[PDB]
């Protein structure tokens, strides 16, 4: 599925992102639109031959499993093509636990290059929420 703008923000409040661990919700609405252009079905290869997956580029080393990671964890428990789904809920429980992780959204490079010190209120501006 790819998400409207304003579609993805109102599911991520209902999922309770708004804020969670500090982060606004257009920190995680911008996030999405650089990992993902806000389509679930999205993948792509990290260098190091692990892979990202669905609207919020969840990768395979860590956090889910695929079964051709060597070496990998599976940290959310899930398998990685259940990031795909159009229903979000396992990507925004599974961004629970990496947000929580110590080192904040600076795990998304994608919000660190392209997001982090910029006016992310901008992504959720014109959404009824
Ligand atoms: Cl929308
Ligand atoms: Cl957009
Ligand atoms: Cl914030
Ligand atoms: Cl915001
Ligand atoms: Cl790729
Ligand atoms: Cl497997
Ligand atoms: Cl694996
Ligand atoms: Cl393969
Ligand atoms: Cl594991
Ligand atoms: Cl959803
Ligand atoms: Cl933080
Ligand atoms: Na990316
Ligand atoms: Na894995």
Same mark, same amino acid.
């Given at each position: %599925?790819?998400? &409207?703008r304003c579609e993805l923000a109102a599911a991520? %409040? +209902?999922? &309770?992102? *708004?804020?969670? +661990?500090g982060y606004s919700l257009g920190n995680w609405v #911008? !996030? !999405? %639109?650089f990992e993902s252009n806000f389509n679930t079905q !999205?993948?792509?290869? @990290?260098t190091d031959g692990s892979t990202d997956y669905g609207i919020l580029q969840i990768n395979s080393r860590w956090w889910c499993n695929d079964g051709r990671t060597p070496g990998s964890r599976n940290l959310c428990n899930i398998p990685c093509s259940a990031l795909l789904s159009? *229903?979000?809920? !396992?990507?925004?429980? #599974?961004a %629970?636990?990496?947000?929580? *992780? &110590?080192n904040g959204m600076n795990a998304w490079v994608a919000? +660190? @290059? +392209?997001?982090? &010190?910029? *006016?992310?209120?901008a992504w959720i501006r014109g959404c009824r929420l």
């Open positions: %599925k790819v998400f &409207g991520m %409040k +209902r999922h &309770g992102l *708004d804020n969670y +661990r #911008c !996030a !999405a %639109k !999205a993948t792509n290869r @990290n159009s *229903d979000i809920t !396992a990507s925004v429980n #599974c %629970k636990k990496i947000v929580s *992780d &110590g919000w +660190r @290059n +392209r997001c982090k &010190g910029t *006016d992310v209120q």
